Amino acid sequence: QNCPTRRGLCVTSGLTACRNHCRSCHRGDVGCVRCSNAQCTGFLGTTCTCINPCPRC
């Protein structure tokens, strides 16, 4: 799709990839959205998360 789902970007691609995916159109919880910034999360930083706002795209 033009807005796929990715969350493993902090496992090897690094925070830079998590920040580029959150600033691009990606799959949200109910539809595709894009956000302003990002950070890595999880017990070992093995997850990617975006920062609001997150308007439609």
Domain ranges of the chain: 2-57
Separation between Cα atoms, residue 16 and residue 42, nearest integer Å: 17
DSSP 56: B
* Technique behind the model: NMR
Q: Per CATH, which fold does 2-57 belong to?
A: Defensin A-like (3.30.30)
Tokens linked to 21: 């995916």
Separation between Cα atoms, residue 2 and residue 9, nearest integer Å: 17
The distance of Cα 40 from the centroid of its chain, to the nearest Å, equals 9
Segment holding 15, helix H or strand E: helix 15-22
Separation between Cα atoms, residue 17 and residue 23, nearest integer Å: 10
The single-letter code of the amino acid at 54 is C
Closest CA relative to residue 20, chosen from 28, 10, 29, 30: 10
- Partnered with residue 33 across adjacent β-strands are 26, 56
Contacts of 40 (CB under 8 A, 6+ apart): 10, 15, 18, 46, 47, 48, 49
